[PDB]
């Protein structure tokens, strides 16, 4: 089992570019990894303060008492005991999928395939639900593992009739916003969603789709939206 950490070229991953361009190796390697994580560290106010407070406690030494109490509470597992648990899990159980989990796997992947990922990608999700079943030592993999697996897969692989409504928003925004004009995310919420011309999910998906189709660019954490192309 291989856990690979790679530093993207140009130092920082540019969201304007396809993942292939922010990468220096063979493209076929992208077809090898089951999952990839393009983590981002965009600057923010309240999240930084919460993270910063966490760091200060660690150097304070409070984290030692906090973790031990959390271990006493059971919310945290000892590193040796967890390793003993993992070793026990590996040797003893070997789950297998259930028809309910598989049927949802096919249906969701069909929607992914139609919107666009290869046939191989769906079978990679089969490993994740097996892995979660292994942790629970359940005799069979369950659909409730797939939901997180799909979410993890979406939050990993997609780093960079409702479709008709989403594409209609694309059609409508191409008329509302000429090429080269700028607006804000909340402005679209007040003008298109508060007027109920389109749903907020359609707003989210259309903006997600338009950026990948080089139509628009999202700037300043949504405070500015600029139409880059047709």
């Amino acid at each position: 089992s291989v856990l690979a950490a790679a530093n993207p070229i140009y130092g920082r991953y540019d969201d304007l570019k396809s993942p292939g361009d922010n990468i220096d190796f063979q493209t076929t390697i992208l077809s090898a990894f089951d999952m990839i994580f393009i983590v981002k560290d965009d600057h923010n106010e309240e999240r930084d303060i919460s993270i910063a407070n966490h760091v200060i406690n660690i150097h304070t030494g409070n984290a030692n008492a906090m973790q031990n109490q959390q271990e006493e509470n059971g919310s945290e597992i000892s590193i040796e005991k967890m390793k003993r648990y993992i070793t026990y899990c590996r040797l003893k159980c070997a789950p297998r999928l259930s028809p309910q989990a598989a049927e949802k796997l096919s249906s969701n992947f069909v929607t992914i395939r139609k919107q666009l990922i290869t046939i191989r990608q769906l079978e990679a999700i089969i490993r994740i639900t097996e892995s979660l079943a292994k942790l629970e030592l359940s005799p069979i993999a369950q659909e409730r593992h797939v939901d997180e697996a799909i979410r993890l897969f979406q939050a990993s692989t997609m780093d960079a009739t409702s479709l008709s409504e989403i594409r209609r928003f694309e059609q409508e925004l191409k008329r509302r916003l000429p090429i080269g004009w700028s607006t804000s995310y909340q402005t679209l919420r007040r003008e298109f969603v508060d007027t109920h011309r389109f749903s907020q999910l359609a707003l989210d998906k259309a903006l997600y789709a338009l950026e990948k189709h080089e139509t628009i660019q999202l700037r300043h954490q949504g405070q500015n939206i600029y139409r880059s192309g047709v």
Binding site: R175, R176, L177, P178, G180, W181, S182, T183, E191
Partner: protein, 56 residues
């Protein structure tokens, strides 16, 4: 006076001046100024006309 600023504020914040379609739609002169701020340096007027029309 802030001669330039007052015009821009009146164009944006019409409710600070004005006290059955009247109850809903603001005057076009102030509303059109919103697109002007969002517009680029050079404007294809046909696209601007369509963009203005979509908001009505």
């Amino acid at each position: 006076p802030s001669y330039k600023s007052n015009i821009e504020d009146n164009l944006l914040s019409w409710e600070q001046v004005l006290p059955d379609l009247d109850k809903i739609m603001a005057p076009v002169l102030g509303q059109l100024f919103k697109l002007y701020r969002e517009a680029n340096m050079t404007i294809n007027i046909y696209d601007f006309y369509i963009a203005f029309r979509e908001t009505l």
